């Protein structure tokens, strides 16, 4: 316990075990008597330490996923000195964030292996979600590349088309290619419209297509 | 601060941090107030240094390839020997070449981590522009 000058009480607590109490008074301090202290201890610790190693690997893969985000890489050095497997599992589950109802179901459960498998599945789906989100970020950068590529393509063909034809065939190419969109089109008409634009963009100042395709 | 009065004074500025224009007064000259220094920064500094190394990998993919975009080959001397992730990241962002508006877009976000992803996206966009040039080059030669 240490004192803070802003008037906020600074106290550091550490839980030890849970207790089943039917009701606490409205409070404060919601006083209630504790009947039994239900907490299971690690028996047959070979399988327990196998799931502890699996939980450690899943937690490390869950942490090493935030390139564009902030998380805690150095927090795994303090959990390696923990000798109790249940304490290590609860410390792993505390530093990983999920829904409140899952935390209440973990707290209500008196089985160590069931909550170990629950935290393992939550870490697996969090690892899948974070790998998917980092692939999404990579695809955001590459989609910026591809959409700038197509935008540059369209604007450059439009620009050099206007610069060399007769203002795009007497303004009429861009007139019709924006008059395509103000009319509602069937999709085959959009494809054919691009084709009519193609037979017009092959020459808007040379062959009759500069006029017949323009009229088309 | 040198003293050469001739109508042009290139001020030697080494900026501390960015700030938001709260309000600007029409002049001339225009007076625009500033906010505090952008001291909001990530605390996962090892992984931020990893992302700075990723931006350096993009920077090496940029300088060694985009010599038609007229970069500088002597920029590798200032990227080694320093332990500042933000300074190295926006040094990569300013050694890179694009429009002023994309630098304004960089200046918009005070979040430091998304800035490196935007700069990596812009360098991969210029790599995309080169492979676009290669694609249209093979298309035009086969068509002719």
């Amino acid at each position: 316990a240490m004192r803070l000058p802003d008037g906020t009480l600074q106290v550091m607590v550490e839980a030890r075990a849970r207790a089943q109490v039917t009701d606490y008074i409205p409070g404060p301090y919601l006083r209630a008597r504790g009947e039994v202290f239900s907490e299971i201890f690690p028996i047959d610790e070979a399988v327990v330490r196998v799931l502890v190693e699996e939980l450690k690997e899943a937690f490390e893969k869950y942490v090493a996923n935030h390139k564009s985000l902030r998380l805690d890489r150095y927090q795994l050095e303090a959990v390696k000195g923990t000798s109790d497997p249940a304490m290590l599992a609860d410390t792993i589950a505390y530093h990983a964030t999920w829904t409140v109802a899952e935390k209440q179901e973990i707290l209500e459960l008196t089985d160590l292996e069931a909550r170990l498998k629950k935290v393992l599945g939550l870490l697996s789906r969090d690892l899948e979600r974070f790998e998917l989100d980092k692939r999404v970020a990579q695809r955001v950068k590459e989609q910026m590349d591809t959409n700038q590529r197509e935008s540059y393509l369209r604007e450059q063909m439009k620009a050099i088309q206007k610069e060399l034809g007769g203002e795009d065939g007497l303004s009429d190419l861009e007139a019709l290619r924006k008059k395509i969109e103000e009319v509602g089109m069937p999709e085959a008409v959009k494809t054919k419209a691009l084709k009519e634009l193609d037979r017009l963009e092959r020459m808007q100042q040379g062959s009759p297509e500069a006029t017949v395709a323009r009229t088309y």
Side-chain angles (χ1 to χ4, degrees), chain A:
Chain A
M2 77 191 151
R3 291 268 88 87
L4 287 182
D6 53 350
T8 307
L9 292 183
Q10 174 54 249
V11 55
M12 293 180 183
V13 288
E14 190 186 14
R16 187 172 69 91
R18 64 187 70 89
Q20 320 155 2
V21 180
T22 297
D23 185 15
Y24 309 79
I25 83 187
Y29 332 121
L30 304 93
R31 307 302 307 268
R33 52 172 48 89
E35 281 181 356
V36 286
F37 284 156
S38 179
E39 173 67 37
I40 194 169
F41 291 97
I43 321 291
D44 202 5
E45 286 192 351
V47 194
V48 184
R49 84 172 60 199
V50 163
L51 281 71
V52 161
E53 288 293 320
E54 285 166 349
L55 210 66
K56 168 70 161 58
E57 282 187 354
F59 200 58
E60 186 187 1
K61 285 190 283 188
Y62 155 78
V63 175
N65 271 334
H66 274 183
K67 300 306 174 184
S68 60
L69 303 178
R70 302 151 186 90
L71 183 62
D72 297 330
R73 172 70 252 178
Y74 296 102
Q75 271 185 352
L76 277 79
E77 309 169 0
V79 307
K80 287 184 297 183
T82 313
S83 302
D84 188 32
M87 183 177 176
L88 188 153
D90 287 317
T91 307
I92 279 178
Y94 166 68
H95 288 281
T97 315
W98 49 69
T99 62
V100 193
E102 282 169 347
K103 295 177 197 299
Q104 193 46 244
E105 279 174 349
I106 283 165
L107 184 55
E108 279 179 352
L109 266 179
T110 76
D111 194 77
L112 167 77
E113 300 175 355
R115 71 183 176 87
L116 279 169
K117 290 179 184 292
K118 201 171 184 72
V119 171
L120 171 75
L122 285 169
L123 281 178
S124 80
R125 65 205 288 268
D126 276 330
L127 165 65
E128 285 184 352
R129 193 74 183 169
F130 278 148
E131 277 185 359
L132 181 64
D133 285 340
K134 267 222 291 181
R135 282 184 289 186
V136 159
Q138 209 64 45
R139 277 189 282 175
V140 160
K141 293 171 283 186
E142 281 146 357
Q143 188 41 245
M144 182 36 88
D145 309 342
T146 315
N147 83 356
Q148 283 299 108
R149 187 181 182 183
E150 183 185 2
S151 75
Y152 295 157
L153 279 157
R154 170 55 54 176
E155 75 196 16
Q156 77 206 15
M157 52 76 78
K158 276 302 298 175
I160 73 170
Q161 200 203 346
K162 283 274 306 178
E163 283 158 4
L164 303 159
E167 62 270 12
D168 266 9
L170 293 151
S171 181
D172 191 0
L173 271 294
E174 79 269 33
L176 298 167
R177 91 177 74 207
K178 75 193 150 44
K179 275 169 186 179
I180 284 160
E181 266 73 18
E182 60 86 19
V183 183
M185 310 324 267
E187 299 88 359
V189 186
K190 273 297 300 299
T191 307
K192 176 188 61 180
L194 300 175
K195 288 304 180 179
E196 304 177 13
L197 186 58
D198 292 347
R199 50 174 283 92
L200 187 37
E201 286 172 340
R202 32 197 64 265
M203 62 289 299
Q204 67 176 3
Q205 68 293 330
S207 91
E209 301 186 11
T211 56
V212 56
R214 180 179 59 180
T215 60
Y216 188 16

